[PDB]
């Protein structure tokens, strides 16, 4: 993930505006709701039977926010997403055994949530730069599978 100056420009102007207490919880609830197999990793969180069960789960919002923290780190560190993600990759691959395809899905529902929140601000070029970041994080995370 190299990112031209205008892409980092696009990525960075938006990211700063992003409600970080919120957007994380929206991505994860939406993951669980839209792709319900992922629920198996989160059954601890309790009641996930309905979409309203899910979005209002305080554990869902608390974990979404951790996740968003990790994205901000990758944004901070595009030139070494690998180094940046070593312990997480180790976690998700070795310990948890998550299929890396679900990293792609998490990234793509994050892009939907950003679109949802920013509307027309979230133009096609801005999306295209975000699809690069998203893919590179998904890849660093799968590194330990690699």
């Amino acid at each position: 993930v190299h990112l031209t100056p205008e892409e980092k420009s696009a990525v960075t102007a938006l990211w700063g505006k992003v409600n970080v207490d919120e957007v994380g919880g929206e991505a994860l609830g939406r993951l669980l709701v839209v792709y319900p197999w992922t629920q198996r990793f989160f059954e601890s969180f309790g009641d996930l039977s309905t979409p309203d069960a899910v979005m209002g789960n305080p554990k869902v919002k608390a974990h979404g926010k951790k996740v968003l923290g990790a994205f901000s780190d990758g944004l901070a560190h595009l030139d070494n997403l690998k180094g940046t993600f070593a312990t997480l990759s180790e976690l998700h691959c070795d310990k948890l055994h998550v299929d890396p395809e679900n990293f792609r899905l998490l990234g793509n529902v994050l892009v939907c949530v950003l679109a949802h929140h920013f509307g027309k601000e979230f133009t096609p070029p801005v999306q295209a730069a975000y699809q690069k970041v998203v893919a590179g994080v998904a890849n660093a995370l799968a590194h330990k599978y690699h």
């Binding site: 609830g29 939406r30 709701v33 839209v34 979409p51 899910v54 979005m55 793509n108 892009v111 939907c112 949530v113 679109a115 949802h116 920013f118 509307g119 027309k120 979230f122 096609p124 070029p125 999306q127 295209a128 699809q131």
Partner: protein, 141 residues
């Protein structure tokens, strides 16, 4: 599958879209081409520049096809037979590309339908676009 609640969801949301559907289509295509350059491969004769009348024109064709599927949501394989043949048998479109376009469509709908893109409708819409893609690659299977 697609439950009764999904059918209601997709119909309501396509309803909101209304006379913009073709505009949302051309935006969706533009989103796919910029984000997933590998899809361009299938459009060598198109100009893919921001103002391309070709992207506009094709975005309507796509929007109309999806409109036909919503209208005929309980008998999609028939509704879409012809398009199946064209896409699986004539153009041999790599099936992975249907996920990419559905993703770009979902993004466009989120960009435009602040109120109606709830988690629940998002799920429905996904389920609807995967059904469309199953039918359009189904000649493969």
């Amino acid at each position: 599958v697609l439950s009764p609640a999904d059918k209601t969801n997709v119909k309501a949301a396509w309803g909101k879209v209304g006379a913009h559907a073709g505009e949302y289509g051309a935006e969706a295509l533009e989103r796919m081409f910029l984000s997933f350059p590998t899809t361009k491969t299938y459009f060598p004769h198109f100009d893919l520049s921001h103002g391309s009348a070709q992207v506009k024109g094709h975005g309507k064709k796509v929007a109309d096809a999806l409109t036909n599927a919503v209208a005929h949501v309980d008998d999609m394989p028939n509704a879409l037979s012809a398009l199946s043949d064209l896409h699986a048998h004539k153009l041999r479109v790599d099936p992975v590309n249907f996920k990419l376009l559905s993703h770009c469509l979902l993004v466009t709908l989120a960009a435009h339908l602040p109120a109606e893109f709830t988690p629940a409708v998002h799920a429905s819409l996904d389920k609807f676009l995967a059904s469309v893609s199953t039918v359009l690659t189904s000649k493969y299977r």
